[PDB]
Amino acid sequence: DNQFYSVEVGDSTFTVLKRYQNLKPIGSGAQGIVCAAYDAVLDRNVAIKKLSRPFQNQTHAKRAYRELVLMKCVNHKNIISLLNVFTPQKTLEEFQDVYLVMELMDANLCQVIQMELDHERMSYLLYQMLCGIKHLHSAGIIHRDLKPSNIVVKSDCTLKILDFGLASFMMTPYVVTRYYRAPEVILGMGYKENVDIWSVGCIMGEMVRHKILFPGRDYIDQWNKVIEQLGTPCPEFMKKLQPTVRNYVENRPKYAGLTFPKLFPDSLFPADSEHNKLKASQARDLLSKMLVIDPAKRISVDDALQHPYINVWYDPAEVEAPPPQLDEREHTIEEWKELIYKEVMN
Numbered sequence: 195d196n197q198f199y200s201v202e203v204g205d206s207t208f209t210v211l212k213r214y215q216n217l218k219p220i221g222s223g224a225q226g227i228v229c230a231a232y233d234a235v236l237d238r239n240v241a242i243k244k245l246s247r248p249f250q251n252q253t254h255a256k257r258a259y260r261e262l263v264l265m266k267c268v269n270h271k272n273i274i275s276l277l278n279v280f281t282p283q284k285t286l287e288e289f290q291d292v293y294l295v296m297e298l299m300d301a302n303l304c305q306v307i308q309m310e311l312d313h314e315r316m317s318y319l320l321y322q323m324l325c326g327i328k329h330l331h332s333a334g335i336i337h338r339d340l341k342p343s344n345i346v347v348k349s350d351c352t353l354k355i356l357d358f359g360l361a362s363f364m365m366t367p368y369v370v371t372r373y374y375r376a377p378e379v380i381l382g383m384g385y386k387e388n389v390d391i392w393s394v395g396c397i398m399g400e401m402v403r404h405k406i407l408f409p410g411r412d413y414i415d416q417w418n419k420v421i422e423q424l425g426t427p428c429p430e431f432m433k434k435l436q437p438t439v440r441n442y443v444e445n446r447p448k449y450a451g452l453t454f455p456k457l458f459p460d461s462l463f464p465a466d467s468e469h470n471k472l473k474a475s476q477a478r479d480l481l482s483k484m485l486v487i488d489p490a491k492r493i494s495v496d497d498a499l500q501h502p503y504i505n506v507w508y509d510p511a512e513v514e515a516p517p518p519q520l521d522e523r524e525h526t527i528e529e530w531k532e533l534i535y536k537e538v539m540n
């Protein structure tokens with residue numbers, strides 16, 4: 195009779211449509227754990243995420259709404275697309291939880307980062323991250339918080355970005371990973387498209403180094419790590435800083451910054467064949483153009499896609515997809531509950 199059934203998964207209750215069978219945990223993270231399942235209607239493995247009362251506060255509310263709305267503005271194989279959205283609640287009044295369903299993938303990008311990867315796979319993951327980003331930007335979406343824990347891959351080396359970035363405070367123990375954020379974001383500057391190239395550079399760099407490039411308890415520690423390694427930015431970069439942030443960054447110790455062979459020595463790269471020796475120097479060259487503090491000197495998404503490290507994968511039908519609601523206003527719980535509910539059933 196009921197379309198739904200409930201099963202305890204790790205600790206959470208999943209109330210899902212009966213088409214989804216054999217639920218099992220695959221990890222948690224931020225708002226809501228996720229489960230793998232077999233979808234008996236489509237005869238394929240899916241991943242199901244529970245948003246628990248996403249209207250309970252503005253942080254959870256804004257991004258649940260945002261991501262439901264933005265889902266319909268993108269259509270690209272390196273960007274999440276949902277297979278199903280449902281609530282087991284029957285009315286706005288009883289409405290509580292949202293479930294999102296997508297293709298089951300094989301691994302998060304964090305796991306892939308810990309592997310020794312050839313150049314063909316590294317360059318292909320990067321190519322795909324750049325294609326996704328480009329799709330987002332062409333749709334008017336600038337991410338600003340790309341990070342590996344929100345990127346997933348299949349065994350065939352294919353890759354999907356799962357979130358849409360920045361639009362705060364939550365009483366939960368959940369903690370925000372900030373290490374992949376551009377200087378523009380760390381320092382509250384204007385930004386444009388290539389804010390996201392920085393994050394691609396932090397990921398690429400960590401794939402080679404197998405350590406977070408710019409760790410830290412908060413932006414104070416993080417900024418220090420940026421300047422220690424890349425050096426103090428030029429005066430031209432300083433003039434773009436708001437007067438108070440500007441005074442702070444100019445009074446930090448001036449650092450020369452290490453060269454990019456020093457920051458990513460040859461020992462980190464496969465370099466046994468001539469082919470691999472060349473790919474190493476191409477990898478480092480691209481890194482040196484992405485990990486650039488000043489966005490006015492940082493390479494763009496389009497030029498990074500033409501870099502020799504990356505463009506061996508270039509296909510016109512992959513980079514230029516056809517492009518295609520705005521509410522970040524402060525709402526109460528009630529407004530947000532109805533806004534999300536409506537999107538859930540359109």
Ligand SMILES: CNC(=O)c1cc(-n2ncc3cc(Nc4c(F)cccc4Cl)c(CN4CCC4)cc32)cs1
Nearest residue numbers: 223228241242243294295296298299300301302356
């Ligand atoms: C044997 N396979 C495995 O072990 C693995 C497979 C996965 N995988 N595949 C798809 C997927 C999706 C998300 N979330 C999600 C969802 F589930 C449904 C709709 C929208 C979204 Cl955003 C998560 C959770 N991650 C992302 C940060 C925590 C992991 C995911 C990774 S490991």
